[PDB]
Amino acid sequence: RKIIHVDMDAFFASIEQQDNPEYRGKPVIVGGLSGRGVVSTCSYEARKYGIHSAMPMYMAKKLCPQGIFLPVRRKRYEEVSEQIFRILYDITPFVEPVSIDEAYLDVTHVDKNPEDIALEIKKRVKDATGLTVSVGISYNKFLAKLASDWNKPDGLMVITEDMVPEILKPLPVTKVHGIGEKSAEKLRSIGIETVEDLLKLFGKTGVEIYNRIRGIDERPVETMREIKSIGKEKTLEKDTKNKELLIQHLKEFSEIVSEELIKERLYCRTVTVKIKTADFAVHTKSKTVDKYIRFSEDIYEVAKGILEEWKLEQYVRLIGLSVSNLSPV
């Protein structure tokens, strides 16, 4: 199997520096400029100051007061993402989109050597957009994405089999990639930190992790991945018939669901509210709207509407929100 993983370098910030010459070479931090704003991404200059994604923006401003701080120009970024994925599909149809800036390609049945292929991705992308892309090459998805993130800025790295876990030993498991930021500490707490300390030495998905650390993944590049539903629910602390607290939950659900839609590059037209009542029954009601929606407050408005005209007969112990009837590709 010949697996390539592509990953744009500081995507939003690089787009901003490409569209604004006067921002080049300087720290650029793209994110939410309001109160609880969070860094979406920042250029490699800015990372030298200690800024990283998900960091609160007021901190980033403290670390880098002279930095250029920008809001998220979502639609411009999606433009550039489409003109990159076009090259990706032109190279081969076996493309598994991961995100607005990440794909896998299964080039096992392509003539050119994977190294030449990655070189062509790089060239084609920088000619089309001015941006650099880090490319990984291996026989796996796990390894190919390790290789793409490795020589991260404008990188290119092959990982063949001979370098089965030997080269992975010094990796901090923070960079596990495979499944991290959920065992950031329950492994730093139980004393092992390097893949070395865990190399073939909780989540009950360890059969992935212990296998992934080896050269073994086997999961296929999945073209044609279709999401039918996206949702969130919460079992409640106590039973309730108070539409007000139910709707606060719906509000927070709307935010989560909006974020997942936006990340998936999708829109929705049906909103579903779900309750579990005190006699263990599940009730759902949905509304369909004419115009595609993706914004947290739009989803929330439909959901709030649904809840208000429900007439709860029994006490509620679970509340959930769901979106379906999704936009294409």
Piece in contact with Mg ion (CB under 5 A), picked from 93-101, 235-243, 285-293, 295-303:
93-101
- By CB under 5 A, is residue 16 in contact with Mg ion? no
Is 163 labelled as part of a ligand binding site? no
Is 101 labelled as part of a ligand binding site? yes
Select which of 78, 102, 222, 313 is catalytic.
Answer: 102
* 241: its two tokens: 């018939």
Piece in contact with Mg ion (CB under 5 A), picked from 9-17, 29-37, 50-58, 115-123:
9-17
- CB-wise, 134 or 258, nearer to Mg ion? 134
Give the pairing type, strands 156-158 and 133-138.
Answer: parallel
- The reply to whether 102 belongs to the active site is yes
Q: Judged by CB under 5 A, how many residues of this single chain contact Mg ion?
A: 4
How far is Cα 254 from Cα 329, in angstroms, rounded to an integer?
22
- CB-wise, 79 or 166, nearer to Mg ion? 79
Long-range CB contacts (< 8 A, 24+ apart) of 114-118?
114/2, 114/4, 114/158, 115/156, 115/158, 117/4, 117/91, 118/4, 118/156
Is 59 labelled as part of a ligand binding site? no
- CB-wise, 252 or 264, nearer to Mg ion? 264
CA 138 to chain centre: 22
- The amino acid at residue 254 is S
- CB-wise, 11 or 142, nearer to Mg ion? 11
Residue 75, Cβ density class (10 Å: 0-12 exposed, 13-18 middle, ≥19 buried): exposed
- CB-wise, 13 or 323, nearer to Mg ion? 13
Selected from 16, 45, 101, 217, the binder of Mg ion by CB under 5 A is 101
Q: How far is the CB of 41 from Mg ion (least distance, A)?
A: 7
Q: How far is the CB of 153 from Mg ion (least distance, A)?
A: 10
DSSP state of 172: B
Please, which of residues 288-327 interact with Mg ion by CB under 5 A?
A: none
Q: How far is the CB of 246 from Mg ion (least distance, A)?
A: 38
Phi then psi for 122, rounded to 5 degrees?
A: -55, -55
Q: How far is the CB of 31 from Mg ion (least distance, A)?
A: 15
- By CB under 5 A, is residue 8 in contact with Mg ion? yes
Facing residues of 56 across strands? 38
Buried b / exposed e across 298-319, counting CB within 10 Å, b at 16+?
bbbebbbebbeeeeeeebbbeb
How far is Cα 97 from Cα 321, in angstroms, rounded to an integer?
26
Q: How far is the CB of 77 from Mg ion (least distance, A)?
A: 11
Selected from 7, 96, 217, 298, the binder of Mg ion by CB under 5 A is 7
Neighbouring C-beta atoms of residue 201, cutoff 10 Å: 8
Active site (catalytic) residues? 102
Binding site for Mg ion (CB under 5 A): 7-8, 11, 101
**Residues annotated as binding site?**
7-8, 101
